[PDB]
């Protein structure tokens with residue numbers, strides 16, 4: 045019989061986010077079901093076992109067996125981690141999971157993570173994020189200069205090029221900073237989570253889109269010795285649960301975000317698109333950053349050329365069919381809705 | 389406990405995308421149970437004709453299948469909510485509806501009538517529009533067309549004078565070669581190239597509006613399901629949930645190279661005219677009204693499903709589609725600029 049195994053999972057999230065934290069809980073729950081309770085993983089909210097800033101190191105050290113994180117919180121350690129979470133203007137969620145599981149990505153990331161005593165698993169995605177919450181209007185790239193912005197992931201490094209001062213403030217600590225004015229702006233994820241955390245109460249302007257990542261993919265880093273110690277059925281249980289949550293976390297966001305955005309607008313949130321001039325500047329800054337990271341970090345250089353070719357192939361294909369139909373359907377659905385609303 | 393199941397799929401083994409996903413599913417269930425829960429997948433037609441795969445599960449001939457549920461619209465057209473409606477939800481939205489929008493529970497009530505416990509276990513995304521001998525310049529070119537097409541889109545196209553046939557995948561090419569059909573859609577570049585349609589039809593149209601996404605189902609005999617211990621049920625559910633991501637991830641990875649190969653070999657890739665798109669969209673909407681009036685099981689699901697699509701499309705237009713449209717265009721522009729070509 046397979047042994048009884050007890051793990052701790054240190055997440056980076058508050059329990060109140062029944063989207064991203066809820067998915068960590070589901071993951072743990074499913075592993076229990078699969079192993080008849082013998083493989084017991086207990087999830088902990090951000091900051092409870094260690095500060096979320098320490099969640100990668102805590103796994104590498106064996107302090108906890110695994111975590112549930114945004115890997116590019118740890119770009120200070122290695123910027124190549126951005127291939128795991130997502131690059132600015134990068135792959136969308138579909139394309140990212142394609143790259144990871146059938147495009148050779150997982151193997152390249154496993155090699156990277158091995159250096160830090162980690163076996164990595166993709167275990168979620170939150171899709172395209174919003175552009176965040178701003179106290180003052182963003183009219184041009186000039187408005188970014190000197191901006192104190194809470195932002196997670198590689199997009200902070202991009203925005204730095206345009207004068208933004210970024211901070212990866214943990215989610216539960218964003219609101220007081222925004223309320224006090226020690227930051228001017230904050231992005232987190234999207235309508236459902238953002239409404240829960242309360243940012244609309246203290247910033248009137250909500251921009252789109254969150255170009256910061258093509259999709260923000262979520263990772264469970266596992267300690268290599270903890271992983272190797274598992275029997276094959278338990279390794280499979282963890283893999284399968286992660287694969288399943290790679291669909292379910294985003295399914296929950298997709299299900300919950302629309303009503304949340306409706307509520308936000310009804311409550312007074314002013315929602316609009318970033319100006320084209322801003323989009324073009326942050327796109328240009330992104331591309332410059334990849335050149336710089338390739339030249340500075342051999343681990344980034346090793347992955348980028350193949351990743352870029354994969355994005356070129358994926359974007360080209362999605363323009364042919366996937367996005368051709370979605371563009372048509374979304375517009376037709378909107379027209380039909382407008383027609384019904386105006387039928388009186 | 390050693391449990392041995394047969395899974396009757398609808399697909400040729402050569403499709404290492406959709407059939408390979410069925411194999412992966414079975415393989416994962418084995419891993420999760422240390423070999424104890426053994427499911428063996430069989431290609432289309434091997435145990436029963438794929439046209440019989442739903443009935444073979446209902447009457448317990450096999451424990452489960454791996455199918456396009458709208459192959460069986462002749463039995464109940466409300467099955468289209470499982471697979472997908474024409475101009476329906478995209479894959480993400482469909483999985484959202486199923487798992488967090490109440491879709492799965494509504495489908496379970498429908499399927500119980502047929503002694504089935506259903507699980508979503510894959511998706512092939514937005515399909516291509518198919519293979520044609522003659523250009524499609526207007527809806528007039530659809531009138532009288534003999535077309536191989538799977539799923540509810542065949543019913544939509546019937547309204548424009550198409551005669552649809554749900555010919556099994558391994559039998560499409562000979563019909564197209566011989567000329568007993570004028571046109572055929574299957575799925576997309578990787579599978580279509582594998583099956584060989586480009587050898588006998590010059591025109592490849594886009595997009596396959598037939599489903600917003602073609603979702604794949606494993607129908608499980610309800611007595612076979614009920615007998616399983618909880619860990620084995622969880623193994624099957626998790627394997628299905630994982631393949632709901634992995635099958636489409638494999639198609640996404642493979643399709644771009646296959647399309648390049650197809651074009652390099654002479655396939656002419658074209659978009660349906662706006663006039664055709666508008667016509668099939670209109671016919672789709674007319675069909676849902678008719679199916680709602682004729683089939684109480686369809687009427688029961690449609691209003692809530694429609695509201696869910698409205699909510700989803702409204703939200704995706706704000707951020708998801710805004711960034712995808714910007715990025716896909718930027719990637720193309722950068723490609724052109726690298727070759728000193730105009731974009």
Ligand SMILES: O=C(O)c1ccccn1
Pocket residue numbers: 114170195196197231232233260
């Ligand atoms: O820290 C962030 O900004 C973050 C975390 C998880 C998902 C998306 N974004």
Ligand SMILES: O=C(O)c1ccccn1
Pocket residue numbers: 456512537538539573574575602
């Ligand atoms: O029969 C079909 O046309 C079919 C089957 C599976 C997936 C997509 N399409």
Ligand SMILES: [Ca+2]
Pocket residue numbers: 173195196197231232233260
């Ligand atoms: Ca974020």
Ligand SMILES: [Ca+2]
Pocket residue numbers: 515537538539573574575598602
């Ligand atoms: Ca099809």
